[PDB]
Amino acid sequence: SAQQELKQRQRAEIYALNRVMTELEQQQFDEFCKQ
Amino acid sequence: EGEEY
Amino acid sequence: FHVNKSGFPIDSHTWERMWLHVAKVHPRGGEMVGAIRNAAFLAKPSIPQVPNYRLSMTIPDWLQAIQNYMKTLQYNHTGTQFFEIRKMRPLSGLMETAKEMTRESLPIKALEAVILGIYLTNGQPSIERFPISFKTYFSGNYFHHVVLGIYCNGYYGSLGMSRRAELMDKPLTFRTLSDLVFDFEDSYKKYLHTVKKVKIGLYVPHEPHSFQPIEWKQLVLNVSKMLRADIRKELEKYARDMRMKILKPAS
């Protein structure tokens, strides 16, 4: 189904994005602590 | 930065 | 600040608003967003199995398995909550949303973890569940956070999700509600957060088709304005009422 493959690509993109923002949130935190 | 949660 | 109210698959307007947000907040925003959305192929993330309670499990084992499932779904850092939680809805609808979370298997925030922790412990009648909410202050802004308080066999603990490890799950080893709540306050101290309000709800019924909503604010304490001994007195009185009387919902 067209719907099911769209939900899978969206899930793959969400998890890739979630990794990037988790990494960003981490180095922003370390950036803050050293100041 | 803001500390969320 | 955004919430997916369009179901699954996520619709275009909601989808674009997610990407525009992360494009704005991320320092290499445009380059990074284009990298994901244009990727020829992306690996399908593994789908964790929903934990099932087993006779080989202790209660702490079960809670740990639930908590590990939640950690595996991951805390949602995208700026877009994926499941709409209307806190005032009847439990039955909130439980439907919780099933939906186990089907779509996406990242979740604190409020959704609370709903999912209720769903996943509805089968253990000796585990009592009640929301604990915090309004904190940090450098010019207020923050709201919520976890799922747990009472079992005389001990307190919690399940939940947070950006911070110390602001979610707590082992079932706190002898009083105060010790639990005070452990959260001391954990917030690590991150320079001052706790302004603490809000304790009622025990959530185990009936998955309940017409009743969750009571989130049975007890509300302005702890930033209180000395610690009076906070302890107030929480102990309240927690003793939870364990004995059946209280009228504050609402």
Author numbering:
A (entry chain B): 26 to 60
B (entry chain C): 11 to 15
C (entry chain A): 49 to 299
What does the paper say about this structure?
In this cycle, the C-terminal tyrosine is removed by tubulin carboxypeptidase (TCP) and can be religated by tubulin tyrosine ligase (TTL). VASH2 possesses a non-canonical Cys-His-Ser catalytic architecture. SVBP plays a chaperone-like role by extensively interacting with VASH2 and stabilizing the α1- and α2- helices. A positively charged groove around the catalytic pocket on VASH2 is found to target the tubulin tail for detyrosination.
By co-crystallizing VASH21–355/SVBP1–66 with the tail of different residue lengths, only co-crystallization with the full-length tail (VDSVEGEGEEEGEEY) gave rise to crystals and exhibited good diffraction. Using the VASH21–355/SVBP1–66 structure as the search model, we determined the ternary structure of tail/VASH2/SVBP at a resolution of 2.5 Å by molecular replacement, in which the last five residues of tubulin tail (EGEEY) were built near the catalytic pocket of VASH2. The structure of VASH2/SVBP in the ternary complex is identical to the apo form with an RMSD of 0.30 Å. The negatively charged tail interacts with some VASH2 residues in the positively charged groove and in the catalytic pocket, including R211, R212, K157, and A158 (A158 is mutated from C158 to block detyrosination in order to enable enzyme/substrate crystallization). Since the distance between the nucleophilic atom and the tyrosine peptide bond exceeds 9 Å, a nucleophilic attack is not allowed.
